[PDB]
Amino acid sequence: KFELPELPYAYDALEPTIDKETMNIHHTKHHNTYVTKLNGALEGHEDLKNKSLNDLISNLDAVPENIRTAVRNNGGGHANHSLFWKLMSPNGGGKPTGEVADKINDKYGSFEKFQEEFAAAAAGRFGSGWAWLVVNNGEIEIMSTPIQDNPLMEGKKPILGLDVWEHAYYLKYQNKRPDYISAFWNVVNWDEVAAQYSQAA
Amino acid sequence: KFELPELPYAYDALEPTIDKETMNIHHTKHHNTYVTKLNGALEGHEDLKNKSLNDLISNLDAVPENIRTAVRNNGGGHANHSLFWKLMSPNGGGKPTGEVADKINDKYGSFEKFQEEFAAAAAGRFGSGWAWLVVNNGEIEIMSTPIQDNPLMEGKKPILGLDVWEHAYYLKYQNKRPDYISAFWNVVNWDEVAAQYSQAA
Numbered sequence: 001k002f003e004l005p006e007l008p009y010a011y012d013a014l015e016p017t018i019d020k021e022t023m024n025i026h027h028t029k030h031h032n033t034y035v036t037k038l039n040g041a042l043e044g045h046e047d048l049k050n051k052s053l054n055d056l057i058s059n060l061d062a063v064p065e066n067i068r069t070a071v072r073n074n075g076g077g078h079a080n081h082s083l084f085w086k087l088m089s090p091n092g093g094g095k096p097t098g099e100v101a102d103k104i105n106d107k108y109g110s111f112e113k114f115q116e117e118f119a120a121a122a123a124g125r126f127g128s129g130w131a132w133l134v135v136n137n138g139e140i141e142i143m144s145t146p147i148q149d150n151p152l153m154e155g156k157k158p159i160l161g162l163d164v165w166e167h168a169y170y171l172k173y174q175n176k177r178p179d180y181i182s183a184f185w186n187v188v189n190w191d192e193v194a195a196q197y198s199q200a201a
Numbered sequence: 202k203f204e205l206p207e208l209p210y211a212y213d214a215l216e217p218t219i220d221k222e223t224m225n226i227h228h229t230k231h232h233n234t235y236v237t238k239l240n241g242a243l244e245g246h247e248d249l250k251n252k253s254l255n256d257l258i259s260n261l262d263a264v265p266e267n268i269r270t271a272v273r274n275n276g277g278g279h280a281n282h283s284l285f286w287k288l289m290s291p292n293g294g295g296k297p298t299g300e301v302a303d304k305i306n307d308k309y310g311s312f313e314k315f316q317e318e319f320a321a322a323a324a325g326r327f328g329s330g331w332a333w334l335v336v337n338n339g340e341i342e343i344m345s346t347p348i349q350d351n352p353l354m355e356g357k358k359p360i361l362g363l364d365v366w367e368h369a370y371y372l373k374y375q376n377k378r379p380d381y382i383s384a385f386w387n388v389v390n391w392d393e394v395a396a397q398y399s400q401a402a
């Protein structure tokens with residue numbers, strides 16, 4: 001029921017920023033694994049096996065203790081990475097657009113301002129985890145979920161996130177995470193962020 | 202007061218198993234950073250600045266909330282990695298020796314038995330973290346501390362640990378952690394484990 005999604009672009013379609021090589025691994029390895037561990041946990045747990053990844057991820061209570069964690073770590077990863085793949089593009093980057101843009105300025109004053117905040121957050125997260133641009137009600141803040149936890153698990157709808165696990169950049173940038181973070185901006189598809197905004201609200 | 206320690210061996214003195222390259226980074230980058238962040242936190246906090254890394258790490262309460270975390274994440278890392286560097290050797294590996302050996306058999310029956318347990322633990326830890334072979338009283342168990350937390354922070358004296366952060370192997374093994382884990386065994390210096398055992402007890 002849960003399947004590994006197709007990359008809307010080539011694996012080298014981002015080769016300057018993120019090396020096609022990690023793209024290959026991070027996609028056909030890690031991610032896939034999550035989709036695997038996931039499907040094979042809900043195996044036999046009927047009522048669960050009938051829920052959307054989102055619902056499933058949201059109400060982490062309906063899942064029995066015995067496998068709650070696995071649906072978490074694997075349910076989140078599969079969800080997080082799923083989103084990630086779409087928040088980049090060979091024909092993307094630049095500055096935000098749409099209401100998302102405005103809101104961003106209403107927020108931290110200027111986009112560059114926001115960025116400086118985000119970059120800081122993405123670098124804040126110790127160990128593994130992700131950084132995001134939630135949308136709590138008519139508002140949007142900046143947070144960072146550890147390991148694979150997804151913000152939807154706290155009632156906050158994501159619209160932008162950045163894998164910060166060292167496996168998402170250690171090949172090309174090793175320990176220089178800020179560099180990886182700076183680079184990110186070039187590929188980020190604000191069109192998606194936009195769409196992901198209207199739906200949430 | 203706190204300084205980055207010298208590697209008792211060359212950076213390529215483990216080149217078949219762990220690539221000299223990561224050895225260089227993991228040592229002169231990551232680790233160093235921790236020693237940096239550490240010294241620069243206790244800066245000004247007098248009574249603290251007079252404690253041994255161990256004491257300091259142990260009683261994580263005496264540290265004010267405002268910097269407790271930093272002494273943690275950085276205090277643990279600096280301690281963990283410090284130990285790690287010594288738990289390997291170009292002239293090491295093989296099977297355990299000394300009372301440590303016996304105890305190991307008393308424990309899981311056989312060393313290979315223990316290994317199978319350890320390897321499992323090292324692979325268990327989700328996200329970042331380390332796996333260890335604690336020594337609680339006259340006994341020794343197997344656990345895994347997340348991120349940089351160190352078992353000494355729970356009253357358990359370490360004698361063996363394995364960096365499991367993806368930065369300790371992603372260069373040579375990428376996502377194949379079990380392989381990295383298997384490989385580990387070859388370099389592990391049981392002589393050290395031994396010594397580290399007598400002292401604890």
Ligand SMILES: [Mn+2]
Nearest residue numbers: 030163165168
């Ligand atoms: Mn990832």
Ligand SMILES: [Mn+2]
Nearest residue numbers: 231364366369
């Ligand atoms: Mn490390």
Ligand SMILES: [Zn+2]
Nearest residue numbers: 044045046064
């Ligand atoms: Zn069930």
Ligand SMILES: [Zn+2]
Nearest residue numbers: 245246247265
């Ligand atoms: Zn003080």
